[PDB]
């Protein structure tokens, strides 16, 4: 009944906005800012050491690709 319970959850919560349309794999949201180092959330396709461009035209270098957050 555990897998049927999971299916019941999938029914009660319909699709969840398609997870905000897969949350747009090439997207993020700044979480922490300190001393020129920031942490971004949700850059699923962030490749190690690539250029991340923010909203003002700046650029960043990804340093840590952790399980849930991307340092820069």
């Amino acid at each position: 009944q555990l897998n049927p319970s999971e299916i019941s959850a999938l029914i009660k919560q319909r699709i969840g906005d398609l997870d905000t349309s897969a949350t747009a794999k090439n997207e993020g949201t700044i979480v922490m800012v300190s001393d020129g180092i920031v942490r971004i959330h949700g850059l699923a396709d962030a490749m190690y050491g690539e250029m991340i461009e923010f909203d003002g035209g700046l650029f960043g270098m990804a340093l840590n690709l952790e399980q849930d957050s991307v340092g820069a």
């Binding site: 555990l2 999971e6 959850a9 009660k12 919560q13 969840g16 997870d19 905000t20 949201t29």
Partner: protein, 174 residues
């Protein structure tokens, strides 16, 4: 580490449920919540950085449907503030263990080399009652990897009479 951090929440939940006489409802709710948080898509939609704890509690209320109450809502709100929502499955496991212990019911698993019929299972159930519990929940499991014999697992206690005899004799040979 995860099990250590789940002691107080599980103990408090069990104490409240036992004092309110609603242990079954909390057990069902906790299993549902553990299954929900185990899901990948739901967890991804839950850890969105825009959500306040109230939003997460409301989302849990929506997915849970009925069986919710002020008690479960308050419990989830308290969990969300400290960001301990991720460790719900350990809380559920601890709660189930405490409920089984309070009812004097222990779980056993009987693993054999051949499928068992009714009389052997009943005989073993009667034998294990000499551990002086309320009941045993025997979950039989066949293993062709073994050759013969039955191994019973009760918590951390195991009783072996199977092919492990061969390894025990091998060590004594060498």
């Amino acid at each position: 580490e995860l099990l250590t951090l789940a002691r107080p929440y599980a103990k408090a939940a069990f104490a409240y449920a036992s004092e309110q006489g609603a242990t079954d409802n909390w057990s069902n709710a906790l299993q549902v919540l553990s299954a929900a948080v185990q899901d990948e898509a739901f967890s991804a939609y839950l850890n969105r950085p825009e959500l306040t704890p109230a939003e997460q509690v409301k989302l849990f209320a929506k997915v849970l449907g009925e069986d919710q109450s002020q008690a479960v809502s308050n419990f989830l709100t308290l969990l969300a503030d400290n960001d301990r929502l991720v460790l719900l499955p350990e809380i559920a496991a601890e709660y189930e263990q405490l409920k089984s212990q309070n009812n004097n019911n222990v779980d056993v698993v009987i693993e054999s080399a051949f499928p068992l019929t009714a009389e052997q299972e009943q005989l073993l159930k009667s034998a294990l009652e000499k551990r002086f519990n309320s009941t045993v929940t025997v979950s039989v499991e066949v293993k062709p990897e073994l050759i013969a014999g039955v191994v019973i697992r009760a918590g951390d206690q195991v009783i072996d009479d199977s092919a492990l005899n061969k390894l025990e004799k091998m060590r004594t040979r060498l």
